Structure 1
């Protein structure tokens, strides 16, 4: 998808040899975690927090300040 445009960058070079030309197509896929311009994740990983429990009975009564 458009992650081609966002999170990977290509670099195509014709490199001149003693014999005929070779070519290098470097694809560097940077992290989405440090893509500080743009959305911080590939749209495939969901980040959840884990919550904190509470004890059941608790004696429902009144506090006062």
Structure 2
């Protein structure tokens, strides 16, 4: 990626560097290495009285 000027104003060797958002990557990693995410777990059955069943 090395692209020069089509501007009326300002000429010298202009350079651009590009490091996009990671939430839509689809090629390799998807989050920064500091990121951690734990999942919710679901609400519980109360006490589970025995009620054993014999199939």
Could you say which structure has the higher strand fraction? 1
Distance 1:59 1:16 in 2: 77
Deviation at 1:33, TM superposition (A): 1.9
TM-score for the superposition, normalised by structure 2 = 0.56
Residue segments in structure 1 that go unaligned for 5+ positions in a row? 1-10
Deviation at 1:31, TM superposition (A): 2.1
Residue segments in structure 2 that go unaligned for 5+ positions in a row? none
Deviation at 1:16, TM superposition (A): 6.6
Say which SS state the counterpart of residue 47 (structure 1) adopts: strand
RMSD of equivalent CA atoms: 2.9
Relative contact order, higher structure (CA 8 A, sep 6+): 1
CA distance 1:22–1:47, shift in 2 (3 Å): same
Deviation at 1:19, TM superposition (A): 7.1
1:35-64 Cα distance to aligned partner (Å, 9 max, x none): 111112111222222111213322123122
Count of residues paired in the alignment? 55
Could you say which structure has the higher helix fraction? 1
